[PDB]
């Protein structure tokens, strides 16, 4: 997809993530588990809901064919009537099929964008307090218990709180 | 020793529903919405409780002039729409023509 | 019914239908298409 996340650097989706479209899986001394990102999920639902409504609203006034009859010496106007009615039905068939293919392309890229932005939201909070593994996961250089994990998921991660613990660990590793 | 981890990921399920885009066809997705009605009941019905006038083997001309084969329609109650066959057999029994017939049928379309 | 066509009546809340162009009542909009499906969810890979 355009944003490189879904079936991209994140190899596949999670059957285990049932309560959000995008979210997290963590593992620490306390255990492991899934959690939805409810904010990005809700934003995306709102966008798709509006999209569906927009598409239907804009098609709300389109052409309505009406039966009209003509006698055997009104063939020219009969033919003009047929072409006119068919002409609008072709315009509107095109408008609907095309709009649906275009918006479908945009919806699937919108999801990819949302996953990418969630990953970056975590990446830019953690900075060098964790290692990027390249597969959508981060390995922390400090212990990160459940309240700490929740601070990452809710955008309140406190980098200064853990920066010295992480520095010591980064140095241990880099010193070999 | 391996550290704690957090991973970012996204919903997957067992859906086999597919949609099309401009660059791709038959893309499998978690969820989709059909927006096209393809079914009907094959019958002619009352419209919001009001029965249509169904002329059977009679034409509009046969009804209004009173072709005696059209006696079902000697008096007809209020209708919602009228149904006429493509080529009704009971029309002008004594042959001839009905002047401005299509214009009359147009008027009937608002009565 | 609330929507009648010469082939049969329609009972539906879909925005579109492909039954017949000449309808009366409160109907969906007619198109010639055989399929219109909007994506809502994500790409779902094996």
């Amino acid at each position, epitope marked *: 997809g355009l944003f490189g996340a879904i079936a991209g650097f994140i190899e596949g989706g999670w059957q285990g993530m049932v*309560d*959000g479209w995008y979210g997290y899986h963590h593992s620490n001394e306390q255990g492991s588990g899934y959690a939805a990102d*409810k904010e990005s*999920t809700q934003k995306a*639902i709102d966008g*798709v809901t509006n999209k569906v*409504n927009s598409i239907i609203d804009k098609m709300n006034t389109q052409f309505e064919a009406v039966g009209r009859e003509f006698n055997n010496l009104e063939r020219r106007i009969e033919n003009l009537n047929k072409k006119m009615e068919d002409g609008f039905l072709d315009v509107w068939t095109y408008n609907a099929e095309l709009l649906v293919l275009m918006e479908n392309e945009r919806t699937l890229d919108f999801h990819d964008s949302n996953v990418k932005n969630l990953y970056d939201k975590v990446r830019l909070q953690l900075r060098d307090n964790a290692k990027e593994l390249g597969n959508g996961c981060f390995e922390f250089y400090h212990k990160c218990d459940n309240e700490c994990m929740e601070s990452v998921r809710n955008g309140t991660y406190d980098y200064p709180q853990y920066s010295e613990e992480a520095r010591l660990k980064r140095e241990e590793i880099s010193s070999g | 020793d391996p550290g704690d981890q957090i991973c970012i990921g996204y919903h997957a399920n067992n859906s086999t529903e597919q949609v099309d885009t401009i660059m791709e066809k038959n893309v499998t997705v978690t969820h989709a919405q059909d927006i096209l009605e393809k079914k009907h009941n094959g019958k002619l019905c009352d419209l919001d409780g009001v029965k249509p006038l169904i002329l059977r083997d009679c034409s509009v001309a046969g009804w209004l002039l009173g072709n005696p084969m059209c006696d079902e329609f000697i008096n007809v109650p209020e209708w919602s729409y009228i149904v006429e066959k493509a080529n009704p057999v009971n029309d002008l029994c004594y042959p001839g023509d009905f002047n401005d017939y299509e214009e009359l049928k147009h008027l009937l379309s608002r009565i | 019914t609330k929507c009648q066509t010469p082939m049969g009546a329609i009972n539906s809340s879909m925005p579109f239908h492909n039954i017949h162009p000449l309808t009366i009542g409160e109907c969906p909009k007619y198109v010639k298409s055989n399929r219109l499906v909007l994506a809502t969810g994500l790409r779902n890979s094996p």
Partner: antibody
Amino acid sequence: QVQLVQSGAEVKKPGSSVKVSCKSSGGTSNNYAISWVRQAPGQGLDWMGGISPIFGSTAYAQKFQGRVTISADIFSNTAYMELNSLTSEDTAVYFCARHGNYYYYSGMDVWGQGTTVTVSS
Amino acid sequence: SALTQPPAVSGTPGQRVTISCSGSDSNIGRRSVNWYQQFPGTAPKLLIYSNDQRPSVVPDRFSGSKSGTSASLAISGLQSEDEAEYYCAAWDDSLKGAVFGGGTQLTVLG
């Protein structure tokens, strides 16, 4: 300001099925979860399940799994609950209620007026 | 059940009254509590959500709290219009479903 308006009272015989509707008026509820919650006479609230139709989720209480079908029509902004194999144990008022967001954890803040179902031979 | 409440509480106009809610680790323990108020024959109203949060339309005399696997609704300054049934509620991760307490009937004395 959205209101949820439910269908009218139902009188049903044993073994039959009832399908109650919940229309969101004054605005859509398609971007939220709506639950169905029933209250038997003199008893407490009891969750039946819910649906969040754009998100794509339908959930059911284990105790009603298999006997209840919850569904939605996003185009008419309506949610439905169909309960099958009715007995007098199902005589209750059934409410639809909308959650504060797309899923079932959040407080239910908008409620329908309720629909009485009375099951009797 | 799953959540357990006293069937009845009472107070006088202006008194402080509290209503308890006992749960388990699979609900109150690990999930947020919502409270609902219901007058007879009418639908419930959301009073508190996320343990202690109050909708803007709900008077500030209503407050909630959660500790351990227990929760409490407090009504400071009881008013006559508060006579109603009160329900606590939470998601339960073992049942994978929403649960409710059995309800408490509040009587305003006097």
